[PDB]
Ligand binder design. Structure first.
Ligand SMILES: CC(=O)N[C@@H]1[C@@H](O)[C@H](O[C@@H]2O[C@H](CO[C@H]3O[C@H](CO[C@H]4O[C@H](CO)[C@@H](O)[C@H](O)[C@@H]4O)[C@@H](O)[C@H](O[C@H]4O[C@H](CO)[C@@H](O)[C@H](O)[C@@H]4O[C@H]4O[C@H](CO)[C@@H](O)[C@H](O)[C@@H]4O)[C@@H]3O)[C@@H](O)[C@H](O[C@H]3O[C@H](CO)[C@@H](O)[C@H](O)[C@@H]3O[C@H]3O[C@H](CO)[C@@H](O)[C@H](O)[C@@H]3O[C@H]3O[C@H](CO)[C@@H](O)[C@H](O)[C@@H]3O)[C@@H]2O)[C@@H](CO)O[C@H]1O
Ligand SMILES: *[C@@H]1O[C@H](CO)[C@@H](O)[C@H](O)[C@H]1NC(C)=O
Ligand SMILES: [La+3]
Length: 469
């Protein structure tokens, strides 16, 4: 009910000079992304760094300031105190949730609810707690369906929701409704109202009543009927953070959510048996599965699973702890190869395992890189759980690639084709570059006890939450 000073936020300079200098560079990258956001797009959701103006994704409806809220905890942990205060003052005056238009429930939960929650737990500023709970209340009508599986889209003023127009069968998407759990548990903790926890616990009850085809989770679930939609399974986009939040719910509960633990380890065993394959060149990858038929392609989004597997190792029964650490390392290696086999040295959105080269994209519309964090995210977990220096080496390769190819005068831009020398800027500075990509890089080159994993569970937008006991 009452704020306690956060554990593990004391930020010490690393003892090795090269590590200090590398981390200082990452802070300089955040200063570049933030200062240009403020110069050209202050109060708008994202920055267009080439056009030097705002970018307003329809995922956020009429809410403002996504980059401000997403950046709060990164600014705080990097010691950017003046910037943190300037963000806080904007939030107090201008962050407004009583607006028309539809928002993505998933996106607003992971970025706005999550970003405000972390800012509160780090700083103790009650405005963040007040705003997080206000937004949580506004999201409750998304769960007003026969099954309790929430709508994808919600008009927060009218409380009326619907699913994505082109969603397969009108279904709700597994990663979207499956990635509410951590935030809603903290909303119940801080508000004292059990309504929030009950909403996400009901999602569990629905899932556990269903037969899982081959132990796998389809990415589509119909909220009107509570039955599966199309039997498309992926540990990348549309599925991934559901699995992530099974593991993290167990950890964030101080390992008391035994249902989450069983769901997670059952799910990962089925993923290993049905989805995980080895290429002829010896690379481990996680394929997509459509009604039983594997497609031997892996996504940049799927690369988060390396860190997920490793993070789940200590809880697993031995000798599967070492098995999960080694599986996480093999995913990390494959994702590093997908990075290293491009021209720019940042990996494509999806990469295939057929000749003539492995771990490369061939489809033109899959060669892009939109500043995504998942490979660096996996490097961070592997570094913290193994301290193998190659994870810092691989992280620094990504830093140099970002600086050579994504840094522009007006911020950071994504790329359309990581396989060509000529620049191909998409002119969007994604807010998750500041929330996630730069935060995980900064943590990689920090000591282990800055946001130590023993006490902090990262939400899927890299917003750290304390363990609930
Ligand atoms: C095969 C196919 O196309 N299937 C479709 C499904 O993919 C769709 O499911 C989701 O739909 C959501 C809504 O999609 C609509 O809106 C978005 C957003 O548009 C607004 O924002 C953007 C960005 O600022 C802006 O550019 C726009 O102007 C607008 O303001 C649009 O992008 C969508 O447009 C695409 O889809 C249309 C219809 O499907 C097409 O008509 C369009 O031409 C366009 O196609 C593009 O995308 C296709 C799908 O990949 C692709 O086939 C095509 O070649 C082209 O590239 C649409 O209008 C989406 O928001 C949602 O997106 C998520 O998943 C995709 C697919 O993996 C990711 O690429 C994407 O980045 C999102 O991933 C996050 O969210 C998912 C859960 O939704 C998580 O599982 C995932 O982990 C990601 O979450 C992490 O992301 C960050 C880090 O990377 C960070 O936030 C954090 O770490 C998160 O954890 C899906 O696409 C379905 C319903 O629309 O329709 C099917 O047809
Ligand atoms: C990465 O690619 C370069 C070629 O650009 C190669 O020399 C190097 O060995 C590769 N790294 C690994 C770990 O294979
Ligand atoms: La994520």
């Amino acid at each position: 009910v009452d704020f306690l000073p956060p554990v593990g936020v004391e930020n010490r300079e690393p003892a090795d000079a090269t590590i200090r200098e590398k981390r200082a560079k990452i802070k300089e990258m955040m200063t570049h992304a933030w200062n240009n956001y403020k110069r050209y797009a202050w109060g708008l959701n994202e920055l267009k760094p080439i056009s030097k103006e705002g970018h307003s994704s329809s995922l956020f409806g009429n809410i403002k300031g996504a980059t401000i809220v997403d950046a709060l905890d990164t600014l705080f942990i990097m010691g950017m105190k003046t910037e943190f205060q300037e963000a806080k003052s904007w939030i107090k005056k201008y962050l407004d949730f009583n607006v028309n238009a539809e928002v993505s429930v998933f996106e607003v939960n992971i970025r706005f609810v999550g970003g405000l929650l972390s800012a509160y737990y780090l700083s103790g500023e009650e405005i963040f707690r007040k705003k997080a709970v206000e937004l949580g209340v506004k999201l409750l009508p998304a769960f007003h369906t026969p099954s309790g599986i929430p709508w994808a889209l919600l008009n927060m003023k009218s409380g009326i929701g619907r699913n994505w127009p082109w969603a397969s069968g009108g279904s709700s998407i597994l990663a979207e409704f499956g990635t509410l759990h951590l935030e809603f548990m903290h909303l119940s903790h801080l508000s004292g109202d059990p309504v929030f926890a009950e909403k996400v616990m009901k999602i569990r009850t629905v899932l556990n009543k269903l037969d899982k085809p081959e132990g796998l989770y389809p990415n589509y679930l119909n909220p009107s009927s509570g039955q599966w939609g199309q039997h498309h399974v992926s540990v990348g986009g549309l599925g991934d953070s559901f699995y992530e939040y099974l593991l993290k719910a167990w950890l964030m509960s101080d390992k008391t959510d035994l249902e989450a633990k069983k769901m997670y380890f059952d799910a990962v065993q089925a993923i290993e048996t049905h989805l995980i394959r080895k290429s002829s060149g010896g690379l481990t990858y996680i394929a997509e599965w459509k009604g039983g038929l594997l497609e031997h392609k892996m996504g940049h989004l799927t690369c988060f699973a390396g860190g997920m597997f490793a993070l789940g190792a200590d809880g697993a029964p031995e000798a599967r702890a070492q098995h999960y650490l080694e599986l996480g390392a093999e995913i990390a290696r494959t994702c590093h190869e997908s990075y290293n086999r491009t021209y720019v040295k940042l990996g494509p959105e999806a990469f295939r395992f057929d000749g003539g080269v492995e771990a490369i994209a061939t489809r033109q519309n899959e060669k892009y890189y939109i500043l995504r964090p998942e490979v660096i995210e996996t490097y961070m977990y592997m570094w913290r759980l193994t301290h193998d220096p190659k994870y810092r080496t691989w992280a620094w390769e990504a830093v140099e690639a970002l600086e050579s190819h994504c840094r522009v005068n007006g911020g950071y831009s994504g790329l359309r084709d990581v396989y060509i020398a000529r620049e191909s800027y998409d002119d969007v500075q994604q807010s998750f570059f500041l929330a996630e990509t730069l935060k995980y890089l900064y943590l990689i080159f920090s000591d282990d006890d800055l946001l130590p994993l023993e006490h902090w569970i990262f939400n899927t937008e890299a917003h750290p939450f304390p363990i609930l006991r």
